[PDB]
Design a protein around this ligand. Structure first.
Ligand code: NAP
Ligand code: NAP
Ligand code: NAP
Ligand code: NAP
Ligand code: MTX
Ligand code: MTX
Ligand code: MTX
Ligand code: MTX
Ligand code: NI
Ligand code: NI
Lengths: 253, 260, 254, 257
């Protein structure tokens, strides 16, 4: 019988590429989304046309709040309701914008969004993932990290704190959930898909920097590393974070 | 004119020892505390005994909440109020307890607020407020020695079982240390960390459990005293570390190097 | 047409498993060996029985010496003479033994030659020679076998540890320098894998216990699995990456 | 009694500033050099004019060879012979030049000479000096080793693989020796410059290119700023510190591509 996966922020871009590749591997998928309702059901439609009743949609804000644990518990619950199991969780959804230290949203909202999406939701989703299993199988969690986590971008401190917290969770959860046969790993893109709204010349500045090919990783290239980690080929791998960055983190100033 | 320093969680233990050594080095200090009012003022009394009006006290919960940015601004303000300047910020205050991922007291969101608030968010807001006050300073046109020192954890990559939120908070602190170091370098504000392995064990910990942790330590088979942690802090704030920023010094007696 | 791979120290254990999985994936293989002649040819015979003319054997000492560069050029040339190409280099051969700092009559300089040569310098020269011969339907890459415990070193293994650290450095330097040629350079870092046969089971179990995921060592095959991912089309953007295959061992404090 | 230190490659630049600061702190010093004889003897003279009988010179090639262990043993011996003790070893001497992985147009040296020089000076010599240092220990004291590492070690410069391998191996040694020598109270630490003193031969525009990369001040570290971290690590304010490598790089290693 088919395994099931939750992918967060799976409506488009890298999240969509992960849901799609997991689907092609034979997973049924919960496509989580926040604001991209149309893209999410459009994705689910295609996947369901491929194989009937193998994709459901689930919407949630993953900003930190007192109700976030409930939302995260529900996200996991939706996978079991639809599919009777939950074998894989991919923590992909992520708020991303600058927060300059020296001077719209209050700083506490930015805290809740940036740290919530990048670290607290992954933590809570991990708790619920594990709780639902215990209290053959190839259970694992993949966290979407950042290969530049130690060469941060200017004025992105909260985002960077969130990705760093995600490294800690990946390692803490790997260690703690190993007795249950739940493996916990990361995939760390460097420059992948640039923002839809980024000007082309700004995109080119980033591409130029990549030693391997002078270009960004495609969403499929990121998804490949994810499906390796969920596979039987990675049965012994846990607490490992795989850079998919084309050498970018190795390039000095 | 003597420089001034803010030290969070400075009433006891490592924070206290940092405050004492900064004061002995010539700093005026803001002693921040949460619950330890008695210890905070008795420290201030002692420092003020040595040099009149060189130690002041400041109370604040550093748990994340919608009033944290305000609280942290006021902490930095208290240093300018008392001493007319703020040269050094030491982020030492820290909540610390287990938070198991699997279950068989506080809600998990209270734990998040406390653990990531004290260890990461408050340091970040204090860093903002510290830097905002140095906005109109050109490091070329001045002879100051501004820095922040973040109290980290040498075991961040070999974490203790069931301490995931604490660990996330310390990881975020490493991220802030590095991000702030880069972003504030144009202001001549250096941002560094000191990472104890096993230092002062909890007062409530059984003596046999204490000795288990002590035995792990290759250099001397003992915990670091609070003074030895403070030595590294004062090096990092000193003129002999003027080119150091984004560095996290381990003070762990080799502990992080020991395999399972 | 079929790609070709060189695997150093390929007669036994992890190296043999890598050579086998590469061959199963469609690679022709050069099976390098040092002292394990019989094992090397029995492996070569087994793979050639599977598919004719897909396996050859190559003897070489990878200790550092004045002749080492020539040996390494010959190992690479060997793959080209046998198969007309060389798509993959796996640096697997490794000397491994204690060298205490404070006090088998091996001199320390022999220990240096053996431990640094096999783990670092031979990898570096094979990399030179590999790159030199390549100086686009191609997928060229190098995989170096590292050590997940490189920053939590075992007691009295300083030269070995220096060897492995130099290999990390080589992986990163070569990844950057060879990227313009489309040559990707990566690492697989076992923690506890195959234990020495002669080691007491009671000592083996001490190591096994340390491992969170399963309380067991990695099989050679599980290590080989990460190797074949790195060389595959599913890793075309991965260079300078070292993947731990350690079942969480490196995350366990003392 | 005054303590004693050995500093390798101490005739000039960073190694000199370390020898000077250790001398100013009250150490007697062995000034090791390879080619810089005049600068070495000139330093010994300045130090001796300040406090008589507190500085000696010792010449040795630290290229890897079958005689390197003897040479390193000699270097350590020279400290016990002059000063009756050896409290501090500073591994500073370092060969530094590109070794491209791909050749095209044919340099000077053979690749095995380059191996012997680059990894001998940066790694093997430090290892043997560490062996001899710990072996010779006699029996209030503060024994330590400081290794000069490199902050850019995981963001290597183009075509410097052998140099980078040496420096990576030196990290390994720092950590391994920290663990292994801890039971004897010998601490082993590192100082990692990013951009400090630029090569004399380097053109001014190239020098300015490196300087402008540094976030903290847009300048290189002086030799004295590097020596400061060294002297902190050998000091009593660092007695619980072992296996730590402190970056002195003005934030350079934190700058993305
Ligand atoms: N793209 C890159 O070059 C790159 C580089 C480094 C690291 N990464 C990591 O790789 C992963 C995917 O990258 P990406 O560029 O594809 O990410 P992205 O497009 O910026 O974001 C992915 C999804 O996250 C969801 N999200 C944002 N805020 C949310 C919130 N408040 N609550 C719930 N969901 C929220 C959004 O869902 P909706 O659209 O439905 O609202 C969004 O589509 C991320 O974790 C990222 O940090 C990517
Ligand atoms: N001790 C060790 O072995 C060790 C190991 C690794 C890292 N560290 C780091 O070194 C630093 C000092 O360690 P330590 O053991 O001295 O710390 P600690 O005793 O556990 O706590 C330090 C102080 O932090 C303050 N604090 C706690 N929760 C707070 C909150 N909600 N709001 C405001 N302040 C709060 C407390 O102040 P009040 O008493 O006034 O309430 C406390 O006295 C910490 O950052 C720690 O993480 C220590
Ligand atoms: N096994 C583990 O638990 C583990 C853990 C961490 C890292 N690793 C790494 O993974 C790789 C494979 O490990 P392993 O246990 O399979 O290795 P191994 O059995 O110790 O050695 C593999 C081969 O290296 C060859 N070799 C040794 N010295 C040589 C020299 N002088 N010149 C040429 N070849 C030489 C030997 O070839 P011959 O038999 O032909 O003489 C040997 O069969 C190694 O690089 C190792 O460091 C393994
Ligand atoms: N920007 C920087 O300068 C920088 C950056 C990162 C790391 N570092 C590290 O910091 C340390 C000091 O840097 P530096 O620039 O002052 O070094 P350097 O001037 O390039 O070299 C220091 C000394 O090493 C000695 N040496 C070279 N080859 C030798 C050999 N074959 N045998 C014995 N001695 C040999 C030379 O001594 P003689 O002159 O007597 O021949 C030289 O004076 C080095 O380890 C370096 O790698 C420096
Ligand atoms: C590598 N990358 C692509 C990119 C796109 N989406 C992402 N989304 C998430 N959640 N996380 C990522 N790290 C991410 N990265 C980058 C890198 C820098 C900037 C950047 O400098 N952003 C500025 C300026 C962008 C602009 O000029 O358009 C900003 O204010 O957002 C954006 C994307
Ligand atoms: C190294 N150390 C000392 C210690 C003391 N106070 C601190 N305080 C803070 N804020 N941060 C630290 N990391 C810290 N560390 C440790 C290490 C382990 C445990 C620990 O396993 N504690 C268990 C129980 C241990 C027990 O008391 O028996 C707990 O539930 O708190 C406590 C302190
Ligand atoms: C994880 N591992 C397995 C192992 C086997 N072969 C290898 N071979 C190589 N080349 N590299 C390795 N890292 C390696 N590792 C280990 C770990 C420790 C000891 C060990 O403590 N050996 C001591 C003790 C031997 C014993 O007690 O039986 C020795 O003196 O060799 C051996 C193998
Ligand atoms: C940071 N730095 C200064 C410098 C000077 N001496 C040293 N000496 C040693 N032993 N180790 C160092 N790391 C070192 N670094 C650098 C950085 C890059 C180049 C460099 O790109 N060198 C090229 C280009 C020289 C040029 O164009 O002038 C070479 O071929 O040597 C030189 C020095
Ligand atoms: Ni981190
Ligand atoms: Ni290394």
């Amino acid at each position: 019988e088919a395994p099931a996966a939750v992918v967060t922020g799976a409506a488009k871009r890298i999240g969509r590429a992960i849901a799609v590749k997991l689907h092609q591997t034979g997973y049924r998928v919960v496509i989580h989304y926040h604001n991209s309702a149309e893209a999410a059901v459009s994705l689910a439609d295609e996947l369901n046309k491929e194989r009937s009743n193998t994709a459901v949609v689930c919407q949630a804000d993953l900003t930190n709040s007192n109700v976030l644990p409930a939302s995260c518990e529900e996200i996991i619950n939706s996978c079991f309701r639809a599919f009777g199991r939950c074998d894989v969780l991919v923590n992909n959804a992520s708020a991303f914008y600058p927060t300059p230290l020296v001077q719209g949203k209050t700083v506490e909202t930015q805290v809740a969004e940036l740290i919530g999406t990048n670290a607290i939701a992954p933590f809570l989703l991990t708790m619920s993932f594990a709780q639902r299993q215990k209290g053959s199988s190839n259970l694992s969690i993949v966290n979407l990290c950042d290969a530049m986590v130690d060469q941060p971008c200017m004025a992105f401190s909260l985002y960077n704190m969130g990705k760093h917290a995600l490294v800690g969770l990946t390692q803490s959860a790997a260690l703690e959930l190993a007795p249950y046969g739940i493996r916990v790993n990361g995939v760390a893109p460097g420059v992948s898909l640039l923002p839809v709204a980024m000007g082309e010349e700004e995109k080119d500045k980033w591409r130029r920097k990549v030693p391997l090919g002078r270009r960004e990783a495609s969403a499929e290239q990121i998804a490949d590393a994810v499906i390796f980690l969920v596979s039987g080929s990675a049965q012994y791998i846990t607490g490992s974070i795989i850079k998919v960055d084309g050498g970018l983190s190795l390039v000095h100033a």
